Symmetry: C2
Subunit: 90 residues, 2 copies
Amino acid sequence: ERIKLLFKEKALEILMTIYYESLGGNDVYIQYIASKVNSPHSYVWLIIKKFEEAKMVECELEGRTKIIRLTDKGQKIAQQIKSIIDIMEN
Amino acid sequence: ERIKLLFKEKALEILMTIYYESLGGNDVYIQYIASKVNSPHSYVWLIIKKFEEAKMVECELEGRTKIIRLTDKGQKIAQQIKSIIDIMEN
C-alpha cells in the first residue's frame, strides 16, 4: 500500500519475483512467476515482454517452457528497489 | 516512458522535484512544485499529503505559503530512485 504510492505494484511484483527466484538458484520459468503474482498469464507475459525490450530481462525457450533471466541492468535495478522497499516498510 | 514501467510518473515527478529543489538550497514551496510538474495544484497537494502520512515529508505553513521538507526517510528514497533513473536512462 505504501509501495503503491511510488511504484506500479504489478510490474514490481514480477521483477522482484524473478529476482528472488533467480538468486535462489532456480531457472525462472514464466509459469512459476504467474503462480506467484496476482496477475493472469497474459499480463505477466505483457510485462515480461516490456522488461526484455527495456533490456532488463532476456528470454529463451527450452522446449515449450519460457525461461527468463535478468540482464546485469535488470539485476541492478531489482537490488536498489529492494533497499527502497526495506526503507519503506520500516 | 521507460520509467513509467515501474514507477508512478506523477508521484515520482513530485518527489524528485522536491529532492533536487532542496539540495539546491531553496526552501521547497508547494507552489513551485506544481509549477514544475504536469499536475494541477489539487493533485500535487493530494500526493504531498500522502508523502507526509508516509513520513517522507514534513510540512509547515509560513504565513500563507506551504513549505515542504524531506525527512531523512524521504531523502534516502529519493537518492536511490535517482540511481535507478540513471541506470534506466542508460
